[PDB]
Amino acid sequence: WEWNVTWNTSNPDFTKCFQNTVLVWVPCSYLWVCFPFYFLYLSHHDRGYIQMTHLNKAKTALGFLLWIVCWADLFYSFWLAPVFLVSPTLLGITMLLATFLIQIERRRGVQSSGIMLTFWLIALLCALAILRSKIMTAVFRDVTFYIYFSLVLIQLVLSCFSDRSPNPCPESSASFLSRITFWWITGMMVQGYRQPLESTDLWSLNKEDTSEQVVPVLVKNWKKECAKSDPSLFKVLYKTFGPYFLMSFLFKAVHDLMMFAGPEILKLLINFVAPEWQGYFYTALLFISACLQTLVLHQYFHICFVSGMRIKTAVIGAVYRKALVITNAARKSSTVGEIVNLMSVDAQRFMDLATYINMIWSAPLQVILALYLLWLNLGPSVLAGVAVMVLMVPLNAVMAMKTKTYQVAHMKSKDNRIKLMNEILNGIKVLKLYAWELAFKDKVLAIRQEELKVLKKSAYLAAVGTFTWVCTPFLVALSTFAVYVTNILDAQKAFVSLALFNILRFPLNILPMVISSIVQASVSLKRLRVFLSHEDLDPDSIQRRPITNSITVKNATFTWARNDPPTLHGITFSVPEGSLVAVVGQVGCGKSSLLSALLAEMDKVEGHVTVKGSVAYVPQQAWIQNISLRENILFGRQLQERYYKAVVEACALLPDLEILPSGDRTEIGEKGVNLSGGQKQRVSLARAVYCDSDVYLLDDPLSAVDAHVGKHIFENVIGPKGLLKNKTRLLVTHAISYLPQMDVIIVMSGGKISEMGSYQELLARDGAFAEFLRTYATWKLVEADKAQTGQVKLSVYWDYMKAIGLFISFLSIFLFLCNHVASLVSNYWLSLWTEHTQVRLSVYGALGISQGITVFGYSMAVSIGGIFASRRLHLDLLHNVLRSPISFFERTPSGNLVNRFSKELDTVDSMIPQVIKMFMGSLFNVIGACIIILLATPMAAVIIPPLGLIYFFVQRFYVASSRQLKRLESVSRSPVYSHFNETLLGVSVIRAFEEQERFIRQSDLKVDENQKAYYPSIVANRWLAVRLECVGNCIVLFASLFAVISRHGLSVSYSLQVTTYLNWLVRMSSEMETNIVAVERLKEYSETEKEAPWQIQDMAPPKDWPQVGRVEFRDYGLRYREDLDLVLKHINVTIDGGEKVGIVGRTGAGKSSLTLGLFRIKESAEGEIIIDDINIAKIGLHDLRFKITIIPQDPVLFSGSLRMNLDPFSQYSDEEVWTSLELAHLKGFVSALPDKLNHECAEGGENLSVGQRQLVCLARALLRKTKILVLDEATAAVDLETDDLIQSTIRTQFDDCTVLTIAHRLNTIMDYTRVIVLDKGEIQEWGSPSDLLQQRGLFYSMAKDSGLV
Ligand SMILES: Nc1ncnc2c1ncn2[C@@H]1O[C@H](COP(=O)(O)OP(=O)(O)OP(=O)(O)O)[C@@H](O)[C@H]1O
Ligand SMILES: Nc1ncnc2c1ncn2[C@@H]1O[C@H](COP(=O)(O)OP(=O)(O)OP(=O)(O)O)[C@@H](O)[C@H]1O
């Protein structure tokens, strides 16, 4: 090796020894270092074995022949030079390793081999170099090399084709080149360019990325962690995601090395402008190194993104499973908002970290490399500069710690907000009926303001950290130079170091974010590890032995939580098989607690409970999913028409199906809001009955149905002559009409078994229950999320800009422009201006500091803008959602509304401001580069348009697909939330019916759809990026080829920078365009039709408007949607002032539709209501709802303080609230509570019994107490003693106000002056109850089934 023949001569020729040693050691060596490592992948990852094909054999045979040929050389050498022995033998054995490797790759099922192809490429290049040398030299050993080269070339061509396999994702069958360049998606790219992409065009998820192949692994690792240990979530994380992620370390290291090597080649090339061969070889080397850098970096990015997506899938699945197995105490502790945050944006924090977590070691690697270069270029003086960086470590770290705390608080606040929103979604009908939309809007606004203040402080600290990190290189430069002068600096020596500082700045300009991502991910890990470590109920607590007493209990002390006192005190009873059991009692005595204790939903302090046989449970509050009635009754069961029809007919559900539009196939709504209370209860009971279980725990299944339907159901389903006659049945009921039929009656008083026996046994004991008995007192309703088809409207960008404000936007743009101008001036000053040294070295520092402050400036200007816009975008949304009518919440499932408030809002909060910042930075960088290359060589400006033009085209070609993918991702994420909500609403039902596995599979399917939408998005980013970077690399080599041909310079180092800036301007613009989809989806609800104006100023009623309360319907036809039949066809009532009127009728007749129409919840289809000579159709919405009270059918208590539930407006004094609780017969219960009125109600009020929730509704009705009271079955799930107490207080407090009472208990309506009988939506018997009884009509019959005659 000497420079005369290798570099100095115009003939590019290697030396003979170099040819025979290094050029042969390179490829053989590559396979030797990779071979061992490759067994790891070949072993850990398997896909079967490929069959015997001609291609595989062709490759194997050529591997055998190639080895022979190489050993044939050793034979001829055996037949002086030392290299003529070792080299042929080494090549032969590495060749024997190559053929063995394709053999084992066949065995392990790999169609395209990256190793073989790259290995053959390197061998080919080495052979090409020797080939050219051997053909320039000119039989004996040359012909062996020609044979070797031809065989190697054919082997390389063969290695490109993909072998046979052992809406599929093309990556599973793509060739090696296709996957290294992400070509397997280009088909969807052009498709997505001709028509908007839909979910149908999207490919099915890869097997490795599928939820049921990812979540289980994480669950198993977590279970092992808990078995061996507090359990550290981080441990299971890398024990679950490192085996695949660690290859990104190799890709990152290779990319770092080659991205450092590239600029060296650039500098040598620009120094070159020596014969033309040197320039051609240098440009080819730069080109191939750049292309390899892009490919390797981009595989690294794909690995990080796929690992992050798998992390999100695993986190969502684990959260779902834990929520399924969670205990009630932990479920109360970890609110629904917290679970929604964990599964919605907590894995987003992990997703981002994935990309930066491969930099935590890369940034200090380049930092220490530049530091060593500084040491060798300037001596030990640089250690002083190190000190500065050292003193920059704690402060930032300290701030990071502070930021962490903020994030924690921020996250906590977010949970609260989401939890509150969930309550608003669940009790929206009650919220609007009570005119409480404004109060809860203000509550959510206060929570959001607190959360945004915390986020603003966190953004301030992040801006300070970014500022100090951006000013650190310049301060280090100045400190090092000042220490160095006190031997002398050389103008060249001084400035060969300034560039090193510009290189070191890159890392110090990402640690600002790597730190933020790590802090957010650490907070997320903490929240998720705390959730996954929550106490879980065990099925082994209840000895659920398969099918001599069906249910036996021995001294059970069940408690809802360990901290709280036990609810069940010494429970002991034994129910024989097939025995009808009624659990009677007053409000809040643990009857539903007893049933949930038999379901293992209650923590057991001590006892022995054995429940034998399958359990079928019906919750007092019926849980209904979005599936139709047939799928609700089936509940994932095989359809048997003979039994399904019998169950439907027996449960008195047939007439409701007759009056339903599509019968039993019509969609039923997210929460059963389509159905009535009685129909909901009947559907839940029929679902339990159809599932043939051995034990049926029925909790008030006939409380919300009339006497006739209740008797029909009991005789045909529950009673001794019903379908359930052979099953043990625990019937928790308050009605005592069916007690004589009961085989065993258990009285639950104070939480314990006060009395046990039959009706004839308890009527002779002469006890408390004896006194109680003596006293006798398809359609497709829901609309799924829709993805917009087209460019996002510029109105969305305007909405995000006008929310930020003119001043903030102008200041941010000015600071961006000033920062990039200062940076350009500094860099340009260094480039051209190169004693003046200290003075110029000071200018570099001065401009540099002037840059950092501006970097700080917009960092504190965009972020606060992100606080402003998120403060507006949410508020309008919070307004837009509430102002929307009840029909909107009916048709929109509670996964779109949660999506806007959880994930799209999070994207608006944090992602969009940062992405806007990086878009403005890239755009101004491109403008500055355009100015730079315009001032220099103005003749080149002719190529300024077309260059940008082509880039523009690529940008367009990409967004037309990319947006849709993002849109589809959001549209694919809305259902998942819904499922969680549903799963969170009916956890007890799912656990009791043992349908946990089916719901787990449904959640896995929904997450699989979401990732089917999300994975093509990241693959699209990679594909676009490869092409964009390749465009640049083919303008670097091209400008380089052109410049070398026209040598006798900086057009290249200008062209490369402009192409890189344009590539990262296109990528950023695509990112901003995709992120604006979040604002588009938030604004989607703005155009949705809303309710009538809340307050009509002109048509305001008098202050004392309902003073008479003379409600007068004219016809008031009611139609929920303009696709169904009327439910209030031509009713004419003339309710007088202060008239006790009772709207009684059959279940599902339209009684509560009257109440919904009185409040203008549903606009009148035909007719009007003139209350006190004032038409409500004309009155303001609040002017109507604030002057009419209602006690809703479904008692919902929003999570929070009990006093907050009684009046969220907080306009009643605590003394008055105490009085209102006293007339509700709840004073004793609230007073024995440890927290008194500040008692925290659970999510949806589950902390209280439904009787106590009805009492709370009555108490808040007493609090309002206007001249119109609507009693929508207030006495529905309360005992007879409480029932009469409620009626007596109403009879007293509501004595001079018009009251419209809908009830199935006719004994509460005989005192009413006159009643409204409803059958199917028409005015039936109409008059005084005594007159109707004389008429002997339908009211008489209803009183007959009620036992009142
Ligand atoms: N939100 C809704 N959308 C569409 N149809 C509905 C809706 N709510 C109820 N219905 C239908 O209207 C009819 C009457 O329902 P409504 O709410 O008036 O019953 P109800 O009189 O309150 O019954 P119950 O006696 O059980 O309280 C039924 O056919 C029911 O399925
Ligand atoms: N999730 C919960 N957290 C805390 N306490 C609860 C919870 N669920 C029920 N309780 C308490 O259990 C007690 C009894 O509730 P349960 O519903 O069993 O009463 P009940 O007498 O059957 O009610 P009802 O008369 O309405 O049928 C009440 O003190 C209630 O507050």
Ligand SMILES: [Mg+2]
């Ligand atoms: Mg109950």
Ligand SMILES: [Mg+2]
């Ligand atoms: Mg009703």
